[PDB]
Amino acid sequence: TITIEIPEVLKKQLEDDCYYINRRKRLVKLPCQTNIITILESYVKHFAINAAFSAAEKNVDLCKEMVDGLRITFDYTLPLVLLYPYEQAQYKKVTSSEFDQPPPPSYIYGAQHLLRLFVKLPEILGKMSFSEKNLKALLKHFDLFLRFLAEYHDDFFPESAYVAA
Amino acid sequence: TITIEIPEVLKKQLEDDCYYINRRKRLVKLPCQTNIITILESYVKHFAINAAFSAAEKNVDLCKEMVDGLRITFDYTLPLVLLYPYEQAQYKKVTSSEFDQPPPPSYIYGAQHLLRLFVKLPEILGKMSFSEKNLKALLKHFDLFLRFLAEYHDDFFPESAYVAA
Amino acid sequence: TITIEIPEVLKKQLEDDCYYINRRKRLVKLPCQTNIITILESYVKHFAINAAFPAEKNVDLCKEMVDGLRITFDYTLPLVLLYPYEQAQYKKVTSSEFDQPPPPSYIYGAQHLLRLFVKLPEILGKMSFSEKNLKALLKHFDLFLRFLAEYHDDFFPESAYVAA
């Protein structure tokens, strides 16, 4: 089985997230002022300056594939496997309002839900059969992204992100 | 495009075959006393000794895959792409008479129809995308088989195989 | 979801089967003196005798079922019908018309054929059957399963299993 280790700073964050929604009865305000598209954009910039100035892990092109994979994976996953029972009415209401179709989850949700995906990812990745060489390289790119997510946790996860009607 | 060269001894044989059926109005007697299953069995024996004693080419296991491919390919192909307009009533009558299902074309037809397949094969092989290394090895194994078929043409193709009914 | 009810005589048999292999550490002797090909051929005869004295009295429709079973089994066995212990046996058995690997149907018997009826609903869900054709088919499994239950003593001798 596949394991994707979560930085304990973000493990806590996930526990907080849970407490807020199904106990303190709160919801992330949608759309997030800073959505998943922009979070991902930000990482790529950060990745590119890092590879250039430092000391597969350095391959900026390989990074971009990961990021794109993430936003596709999220778009599909969110309404199926990443919601809490309480968050259901919000989703329905949000997607109901290019050709006047339903905006994709990536443009509406933020860091809170993106992180949730990293919990489900191993099971999903198990189901598509990755080659050895490609999987390791990918899993490493998640670690880097998670490290990035932990390193700037204060900026990506403001408490004021949550709501109460 | 893929080319499978036919030994001119067998090219003639194919021209004879044609003349017999839609001009001299003749039909191969079915089932053939010597069917395609046995022809193929014969080649494998001959391949195996011609390796052990001599002087992908000499690979007895690789040969066996080819032969098995041929009998699957033929079974499927015959009633679709290998018959002449006149031969249609014969096919219907033949298959109509393990669990009392329709005997597969391989157990009914012989050298006459097997050869026809080598005309259509390039078309068919184009449609399944073979890798470079595997295709060349395969095409060579057809040449050897065709060589074998030409070398013993008198035995495999008796004129008495055809009928007036 | 599709359900194929198993006669409780055969439900027990399946529980016995399990206990033998991964607890009492036993294996069906292969090849079975009476394999799946012959079991299936036996049913067809004793479907046709039964018929003599529109729906599921169609001997032709019966034959399609039986042939489907032997194709489905051939494919299914090494993937979804083995127990972890039975793996080495499969490898050894298939390793020994053109000197290819004999198909599972000519090697295995009533023990494994029955296992398939547990997995079948799942598999049949994945190929989209028409309403009219599925019901007719499911009924033909019931008949076969009753047949299998009716002669359970003959098809399932205990001596089918070994220590070695």
Binding site: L62, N134 | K127 | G68, T76, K119
Partner: peptide
């Protein structure tokens, strides 16, 4: 590695009048 990346209807295996689905290996229970 530099990418996670690298057309004809085909004949299927048919049983009971329908194509056989591919199955991922699994221990029987």
């Amino acid at each position: 590695v530099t990418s996670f990346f690298p057309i004809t209807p085909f004949l299927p295996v048919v049983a009971f009048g329908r194509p056989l689905p591919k199955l991922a290996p699994q221990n029987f229970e």
